[PDB]
Every structure is written in C-alpha cells, then in structure tokens.
C-alpha cells in the first residue's frame, strides 16, 4: 500500500510546526496544489496526514472511533479543563451515553424557551453600551453568551450564581486550551496551568453547591440539570455531581468561543456590507411584524437571509479549523494506505475556501447558496461543525442562540467599521480570533 505523498522538512523535531502556525491555512492550500488531497508532513516530532477536500474527508467524517480515534488526541487537553470521568477521559460508549443525556436539553421543546431568555439578556446586556460608541465586541459577546448558555443550559439556580469573578474562572480553565496544554506536560508549573487546576475547583465547588440545591427541591424542572441528576447508565450506575459538573462546564465551553467568534466576525461582514445589514434588519420586519414583538422560535427559521449570513460566516470564519483523530486501524484513501499511528486530520477551513469547488472563494457573499453550491453539492465541503457521525451536538442551539443574539443586536443597533478597518485573523489561537474586534455601533431607530 503506497503511502500519502511526504512533505520533507529539514527541521528535526519541529518540522513544518511554524511555517503552519504563521499562516495554517495558506499553508494546507498550497501542500493542496503541490501534493493534491492527501498528503503527511510532521510537526512537533508527530506525524499529520491532512485529508482535503470531500473525496478524502469522507475518511474521517464516516469513521469509526475504533479505526480513528478522538481520546487519544483530545484527552491531555480536555481532562484538565472539564475533569475526570466526562468526555474524552472515558470509553466511547460511556461518552455517548452521556452525550445522550445532554441531548434531553438540546430540543425544539427547550429551544422555544431559549429564544425569549437569550433575546432578554441581550437586551438587558447591551443597556450599558449606551446609544452609540465604539466597544470590543468580541470582549462583548464572549460576556453575553457565557450568560445566556449558563441560563438556556446550566439553569437559574447556576445563572443566579454567575459573576465577574466566575466569568474569569471560565476563562481560566479556557487557558487550559494552549499549544502549551496539547505538548508540555499538564503537573508542569507554568501560570495557565496553575489557573485552570485552581479555577476547576473553584468552579466544580459553586456547581457542587447547586446541585445540592436541587437535589433538595419538592418540585422538579424539566432541563439538563435534572436529567444528568436523575439518570443513569445502563448498567443504572448514577452520576457522580462531579461528572454533572464537568459534563456542564464541558458543554458550556465548547460553545463559547466557537459561538463568540462567529457573532463576532458575522458582525464585520455586516458592518463591512452596510447595504446586507439593512436588509437583515428588514428581514426582522417582514418576518417578525412592524412592531417587532418578541421573538420566537418559528420566526428564527423564516430569518433565511440572516441564516446565509450565519452560513457564509462560518464558511469564511468557522472557529474550529481541524478535527483530528488517532489512526490504530490502516485506513485506505485516494488510493493512498495512511499507516496506524498517523493523526488523520480535516481542515473545515480549507474545504470551505478550496478554489476548485468555491466560486468567489474569499467573498463573503451570503447569495452563493440560491444558486449552484459545495454546500449542498458534495457532501464535506461545507463541514463548519462536522458531519457523519463526527458532527457538534450544539449545532442548533449555535443557531438558536446567535440567530436571537444578532436579530435582537440588528434591532438595537447598526453597525459600521472603524475607518473601513476589517479585523485580520489572530492565527496564533486554537480558535481563530478577530484582530482588534472595536466596532462602532449607534441607535437603530
Ligand atoms: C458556531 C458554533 C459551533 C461550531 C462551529 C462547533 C463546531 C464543532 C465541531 C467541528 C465539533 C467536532 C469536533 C471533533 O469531532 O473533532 C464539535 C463538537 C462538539 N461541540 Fe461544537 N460547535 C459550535 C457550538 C457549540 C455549542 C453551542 C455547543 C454546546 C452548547 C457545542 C458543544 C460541542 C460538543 C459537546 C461537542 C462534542 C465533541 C464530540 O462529540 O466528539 N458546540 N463542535
């Protein structure tokens, strides 16, 4: 079996790792015209093979976890921030239980509920931003959307203990997501290290606390919570209010800046396209009625040109730019043997932009999607969130919260560019972060 064409580097032990970390993606479409779809090169003593384009992503996205593996490649990042016996530190089968679980929250039933409390507190919010000025958005949003997951997700007895104070918290065990995470050991004494470890337990303690709380209640309420504290296995063992904790914080945070950076470039695509902007806001007055009442699930899915404005941001800008798994099982593509030991990756970022299936490839133009598209022409082009099985379980809680985020923002406010400056992309991150994200804003009517 011949192996994927080999990108040779004269670097020992880095390889190719600071050509990529300047710019990944011009790196990965360049290996594309030179080598094609799949190709190896080694990084930090480890050897990657990048599947580009839809033919060979089709690998990963049909995969089984036995074949390519997540815990191996995400346990040592994720097991310090969320805790022990959740996500990527147990079995596969026990993960899927408890994504089972969460998925009781995660439904049109509950999304109903959600609309209203997101669109208050993005009201509420946003009353300190005053008439008009020019503010951090991305600062803004991230402050927004830990409120509004903590209340939609965590429940009122969690939002009710929500401040500044836990808010950093949030952000310390958010350190735990560094290069320095994924290759330096965790015990190592270095301060994001320290902040993640002191924060988990600070966090796990407030969350142990709200447990009790409820635990203790006469009546019961239907959302996570009560699930994750009332159910069981199969086997029927109970959840320890650790694994409630960590199953929580875990959820709330792998939403939270892949949701604030989208709300946060979708609003450089508006305010860049001033004329795309007005006509979203006049989408809310169609849709929704001139005098524009609160807002509603079935109204959300009728907003169909903010929908494309969400879709061609996250084509342009999606916050997870690789998903990678192990290779233990010989895989076959392309005519290509990727060998057992190979981390097997997809760069939604690169399919999403790939010159040979993208029209007008850096354009951001919301219209490509009424007529001939990737997106609905193959199957892993467009892949912001995963597809197959390795796809986000929060996609339609992404939806309902950024679409009741912006179509209450496009209300308030409109929005422009600071002397035409668009944010360059911060490549330096995991998730990939706007560059000097001030905004200017004033009073939509
Ligand atoms: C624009 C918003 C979002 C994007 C683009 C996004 C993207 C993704 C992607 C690409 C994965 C797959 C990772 C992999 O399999 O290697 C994923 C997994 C996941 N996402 Fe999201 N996500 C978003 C928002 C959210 C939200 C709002 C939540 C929860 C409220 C969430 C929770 C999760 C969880 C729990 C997983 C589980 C990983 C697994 O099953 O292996 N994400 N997301």
Redesign the pocket.
Known sequence: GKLPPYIFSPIPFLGHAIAFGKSPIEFLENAYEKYGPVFSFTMVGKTFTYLLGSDAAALLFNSKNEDLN?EDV?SRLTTPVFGKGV??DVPNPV?LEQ?KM?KSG?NIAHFKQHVSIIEKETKEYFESWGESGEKNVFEALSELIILT?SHC?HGKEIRSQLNEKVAQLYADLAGGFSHAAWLLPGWLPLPSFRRRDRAHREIKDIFYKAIQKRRQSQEKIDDILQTLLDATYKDGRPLTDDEVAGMLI???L??QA??ST?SAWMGFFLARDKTLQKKCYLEQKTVCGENLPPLTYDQLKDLNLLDRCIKET?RLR???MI???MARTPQTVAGYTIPPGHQVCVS?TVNQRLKDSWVERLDFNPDRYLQDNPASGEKFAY????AGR??????N??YV??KTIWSTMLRLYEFDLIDGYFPTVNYTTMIHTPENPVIRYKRRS
């Open positions: 997540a995400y996500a990527y993960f994504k969460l995660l997951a997700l875990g959820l709330l792998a939403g892949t949701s989208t996250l999606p916050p997870i998903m990678m798994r939604p892949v912001p969130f995963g390795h796809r986000c379980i929060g996609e809680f992404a919260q950024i």
